[PDB]
Ligand binder design. Structure first.
Ligand SMILES: NC(=O)C1=CN([C@@H]2O[C@H](COP(=O)(O)OP(=O)(O)OC[C@H]3O[C@@H](n4cnc5c(N)ncnc54)[C@H](OP(=O)(O)O)[C@@H]3O)[C@@H](O)[C@H]2O)C=CC1
Ligand SMILES: NC(=O)C1=CN([C@@H]2O[C@H](COP(=O)(O)OP(=O)(O)OC[C@H]3O[C@@H](n4cnc5c(N)ncnc54)[C@H](OP(=O)(O)O)[C@@H]3O)[C@@H](O)[C@H]2O)C=CC1
Ligand SMILES: NC(=O)C1=CN([C@@H]2O[C@H](COP(=O)(O)OP(=O)(O)OC[C@H]3O[C@@H](n4cnc5c(N)ncnc54)[C@H](OP(=O)(O)O)[C@@H]3O)[C@@H](O)[C@H]2O)C=CC1
Ligand SMILES: NC(=O)C1=CN([C@@H]2O[C@H](COP(=O)(O)OP(=O)(O)OC[C@H]3O[C@@H](n4cnc5c(N)ncnc54)[C@H](OP(=O)(O)O)[C@@H]3O)[C@@H](O)[C@H]2O)C=CC1
Lengths: 275, 274, 274, 275
C-alpha cells in the first residue's frame, strides 16, 4: 500500500482519489433514466405506483412488485403508454428467500438492475404500545419495515457490486426523525429510524459501486377528522402531500442528477420536521 | 373535554399544564438514588457493571442481569460495600417470555423498580454485510440490540405506569448517529438508531408516568492500526473509560433530570462532531 | 375564527387544509423553469455559475450577481446560448442597503423573481480561532455568510409574498452539520449552521407564499496532504464537481419539490455519515 | 512525526493516544466543584442565577455577571450562605472589549477560571421577520446571542489553554434544533443554531486543553394565555420547565462527571424536540 492513499472509510475504493463520472452538460439530461432498469417494491400502493410511472416517464424499464393486490395491468399500463419494458412480480418481502428469488428473476428478465426502490411497508395502527400485550405487531413492523428493506438491499447490492454501478432508494418516513402525534407509533418510528441510518451505513459500505439514499415523506394523501386536523395544524405548508409531489425526489436520487449524493435523507414533509 | 386544555401529544396527561415535581433545593441531593430500586441489564459487562456500582454509590438497590457470565459475586459486592440490597439474575434478553419472568421476579424481590437501564447488547464483527451470505448475524443483532431492548421497555413500563413514576435509560451508541469506520457494522448501526428513536417515541407515550432517555457512548476501552484510526478521528484523542459514563447515567436516572426526556446524551469524546 | 381550523405554525395560512398545487402529470415537466425568473447570488463563482447556467438550461431568466469579478460575459452567454433574458449585477452583499437596491432593480428589469439562490460567501482561512487576536475575520464571515444571506432573504421574501409564490434556495455547507478537519473553521461552521436553521425558520414563516430549502455541499473541486485526508474521510473517495450539484438546485427551485420546504439536501459524497 | 500517530482532528493533541485523567472512584465525588472557579454570564436572570447557586452548592467560587440589574447582593448571598468566594461584574457582552476586560479581571481576582457558562441573551419579540423593516433587531440578536457568546469563548479559551484544563458550557436553546411556533423567531433560532454548532467546532479546536458543551433548554418558567397553552399542548411532559430542573445538566457538564463528554448538546426541553 506504499505509494497509495487508502480510504479510512472503505479501502475497496482503491487508490484515492476515485475519479468523477462523465455527465451530460445539460441538467435536464441528468434526470433521464433511458437505458436503465428500475425495481420498485410496494408499487401496488400509492407512493410506489407513483414513482414507478415517474421512472417510466423518465425512460426506465420498471419491475413492479405486489403482494396481495396483483398489479400486472399496471405493468401493462407502463408498456402500453410509455413503450418501456415492465412486469409485475408477487413477493412477500418479510420472507428473505422470496425476495432473493424475485430479484434474481428480475435480473434475468431485464438483464440487470440499475435502480432499486425499497418502498413496501405497513403501518402500526394499534395506539400506545403499553396496551398491546403480545409482540406480534411489533415483530410484523420490524420484519417488513426493517428486515424486509435489508433483504432487498442485501440482494440487489450484489447485483450493483457485480456491475460496479447502481442507486438504491429507501422509502423511510418523517417518523424516522420525529415522533408522530397524537397517533402513537413507537414500533413504526423505530423501524423507520433504522431505515434512515441503514441508508447511511450502506452508503459507506457500497461506496465503491453504488449510491444509497432515502426519502422521508410526510403525510401523503394515500382517517378520523379530528386527527387529520391536528396533522394539518402542525405542518407548515398546512396540508397533506400528494404522491405526485414525491416523484421528483425519487427521480433525483435514482438518476445521474445526484452522482455526488449518497447517505442523504431527503425530507419531503411539508416542513413537518421543522416545528 | 370542555374547560380543559388537552395535549396534542398524549391525552393521558390530563388537563394541562401538568404539575412540576418537588425537588430538593441543593443540586447535589438531586443526584441521590436513596430509597430507589434500579435494574441494569448487561451488568455483568463493562459499562453495565460500572453503572450498577455507581447507582449503588448513589444509594440505589441494584438488580444485576447476566447471561453467560454469572455475576452473583458482583451483587454481593454491592451489598457488602454499600449496604444496599442487590441480587443477580440470569436471562437471555432475546427471549421475551424470559425477560417478563425476570422483571416480574425483580418487582417482587425489591417491591418496585424506579430506574431501568436497557444495556445488554452484542456487536457486529463480520465486516461488510455484502459478504455475509446468511442472515443469522443480522437477526442476532436485531433481536438482542433492538427487540430485546423493547422487551424490557414494554415490561418495565407497566410497573412505571402502575406506580406513576420511573426513569428508563437506554444504552444506545454513537453508532446510532454515525457510521463507524473502518470496521463496517451496518446491522449494529441500524439497531442503535432504532434504539435512539425508540427512546424518543417512548418518551412521548410514557410521559404521564415516566421519563425515557438514552446514552450514546463512543469507543470505551483487535488490530492496532484500527484503534489508531479511531484515535485520529476522536477530538479528545483517546478512547473512553467506563467511569467516564456513570455521571451521564446517574444524571438521567435521578431527580437531576426531571425535565429531561427523549434526550440522547452523547459521551463519545466528540467523535460525532467531525 | 369559529368554524375554521387554524394553524399552530402560521395563521397567515388561512383555514386548513390549504390547497394542493396543480402539477404536470409528467415528472420531467415538473423540473422545467420556463416562464420563471431566477436570481443567483455569487454566480460569478464556481457553484453559483453552474446553478445559473443549469437554470437557464431549464428555461429560466437568470439574474447574475458579482462583486469583484465582473460577470457580464456570463450573462451574455446565457442569452446567446439558451435564448433567455439575463443581466449581471454588482453588489457587496454584506451591505443591506446595497442588497435591497439590487433586488428591486432586478424586479423591475425582469418583472418578478420566482427563484432566489442565496449563494455568495467567503471561507475562513486562518486556522484555529484561538490564535486570531482580531475579530475582523469572525465578523467578516458572519456579515457575509449569515447577515448577507438574511439581507437577501428578507428582501426577496417581500416579492414572494406580493406574488404569492416563490422558492428560496440557500447554499449552506456540510460545515453547518459537521466540523471540518484538519482545517479549523469555527466561524464558518457557525455561520453555515445558522444558515441551515434560518432555512427551517423561514420555511415556517413564509409557508403561505413560498418554500425555503437549502443545499449543503461537501468538498467541491492548498496542501496535498490535507485533501488526502479529505478523500480518506469521504465515503465516495473524491471531491465533487460543480455539475454534481445542479440537480439538487433544480429540484428545489422547480415544481418538482412543491411539498419540500425547510429541507436540507446534503450533497457531500457521504462525508456527514462517518 | 515518524513514530507518532498524529490526530486527524487537531495535531496539537500530540502523539496519540492522549491519556485519560484520574477520577475519583465514587460517582458522587465526580460532580464536586470544590477548588474550582466558575464564571456564569447572565447570572442576574433566572437560568444564570440558578446555575450560579448550584455551582456554589457544589463548592465552586462563582463570578456573577450583570448588565442592567446589579447583582452584588447575589454574590454576597453565595459567600454568606456557602462560604465560597463570589463577586459581581458589570459588562455589556455585545461589546468584545468589555468582555475581555471583565474576564481578565476575574482571572486576577480568583486566580484562574476552571468553568465558564456563556448564558446571557435576549429574545426576539417582534413576530414574523417579514414585517420588521430595519435590521437593528436582527443585529441585536446576532450581536449578543452569537457574537457575544464567541467573545466570551475566545477570551476564556486562552485561559483554558494556558492552564491546560477547562470546561466551557454554552446556553443554547431548543430553538437551535427546532422552529418555535406560533411566536415566529427566525433571528433567535438562527443565533441559537450557530451556538450549538460553535460548541461542536470549539470542542474540536480546544480538545487538547478543554471540553466544550451546550445545554438546549426548552420553555422554562422564567405571556398571553392562548400562546402558552399551545406550548403545553406540544410538549410531551405537558408543562413548562423550572430553572431548578436545569442545574443538574450544567453541573454534569461543568464537573469531572463528563470528562469524556465534549461537543454534546444536552436537550432539557420536556421532550419538545421529539414530536
Ligand atoms: N408518517 C408515515 O406514516 C409515513 C409512511 N411512509 C412509508 O411509505 C411506504 C409506502 O407507503 P404507501 O404507498 O403510502 O402505503 P400503501 O398501503 O398504499 O402501499 C403499501 C405497499 O406495500 C406492499 N406490501 C404490503 N405488505 C407487504 C408484504 N408482506 N410484502 C411485500 N409487500 C408488501 C403493498 O402491496 P399489496 O397491496 O399488493 O399487498 C403496497 O403496494 C411505506 O413504507 C410507508 O411506511 C412514508 C412517509 C411517511
Ligand atoms: N464498549 C464500547 O465501546 C461500546 C458499547 N456500547 C453498548 O453498551 C452495551 C454493553 O457494552 P459493553 O459493556 O462495552 O460490552 P460487554 O461485552 O462487556 O457487556 C455485554 C453485556 O451484555 C450482556 N448480554 C450479552 N448477550 C446477552 C443476551 N442474549 N441476553 C442477555 N444479556 C446479554 C452480557 O452478558 P454476559 O457477559 O453475562 O453473557 C454483558 O453483561 C451494549 O449495549 C453496547 O452495544 C455502545 C457504544 C460503544
Ligand atoms: N467550493 C466548496 O467546496 C464549498 C462551497 N460552499 C459555499 O458555496 C458558496 C460559493 O462557493 P464557491 O463557488 O465554491 O466559491 P467561489 O469563490 O468560487 O465563489 C464565491 C462567489 O461569492 C461572491 N462574493 C464573495 N464575496 C462577496 C461579497 N461581499 N459580496 C457579494 N458577493 C460576494 C463571489 O463574487 P466575486 O468573485 O465576483 O467577488 C463569488 O461569485 C458559498 O456559499 C460557499 O461557502 C459550501 C460547501 C463547500
Ligand atoms: N425557547 C427559548 O426561547 C429559550 C431561551 N434560552 C436562553 O437561556 C439564556 C438565559 O435565559 P433567561 O435567564 O431565562 O432570561 P433572563 O431575561 O431572565 O436573563 C437574561 C440575562 O442576560 C443578561 N444580559 C442581557 N443583555 C445583556 C447584555 N448586552 N450584555 C450582557 N448581559 C446581558 C441579563 O442581565 P441583566 O438583567 O442584568 O441586564 C440577564 O441576566 C438565554 O440565552 C435564553 O436565550 C434557553 C432555553 C430556550
Amino acid at each position: 500500500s506504499m505509494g497509495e492513499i487508502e480510504s479510512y472509510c472503505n479501502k475497496e475504493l482503491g487508490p484515492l482519489p476515485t475519479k468523477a463520472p462523465t455527465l451530460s452538460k445539460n441538467v435536464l439530461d441528468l434526470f433521464s433514466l433511458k437505458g436503465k432498469v428500475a425495481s420498485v417494491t410496494g408499487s401496488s400502493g400509492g407512493i410506489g405506483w407513483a414513482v414507478a410511472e415517474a421512472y417510466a416517464q423518465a425512460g426506465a424499464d420498471v419491475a413492479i412488485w405486489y403482494n396481495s393486490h396483483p398489479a400486472d395491468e399496471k405493468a401493462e399500463h407502463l408498456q402500453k403508454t410509455y413503450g418501456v419494458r415492465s412486469k409485475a412480480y408477487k413477493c412477500n418481502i418479510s420472507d428473505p428467500k422470496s425476495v432473493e428469488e424475485t430479484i434474481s428473476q428480475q435480473e434475468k428478465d431485464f438483464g440487470t438492475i440499475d435502480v432499486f426502490v425499497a418502498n413496501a411497508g405497513v403501518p402500526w395502527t394499534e395506539g400506545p404500545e403499553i396496551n398491546v400485550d403480545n409482540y406480534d405487531s411489533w415483530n410484523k413492523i420490524i420484519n417488513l419495515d426493517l428486515n424486509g428493506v435489508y433483504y432487498c438491499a442485501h440482494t440487489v447490492g450484489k447485483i450493483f457490486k457485480k456491475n460496479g454501478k447502481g442507486s438504491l432508494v429507501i422509502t423511510s418516513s418523517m417518523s424516522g426523525t420525529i415522533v408522530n402525534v397524537p397517533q402513537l407509533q413507537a414500533a413504526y418510528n423505530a423501524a423507520k429510524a433504522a431505515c434512515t441510518h441503514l441508508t447511511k451505513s450502506l452508503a459507506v459500505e457500497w461506496a465503491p459501486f453504488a449510491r444509497v439514499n432515502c426519502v422521508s415523506p410526510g403525510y401523503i394523501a394515500t382517517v378520523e377528522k379530528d386527527m387529520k386536523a391536528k396533522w394539518w395544524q402542525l405542518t407548515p405548508l398546512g396540508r397533506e402531500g400528494l404522491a405526485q409531489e414525491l416523484v421528483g425526489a425519487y427521480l433525483y436520487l435514482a438518476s445521474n442528477a445526484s452522482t455526488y449524493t449518497t447517505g442523504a435523507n431527503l425530507a419531503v414533509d411539508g416542513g413537518y420536521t421543522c416545528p
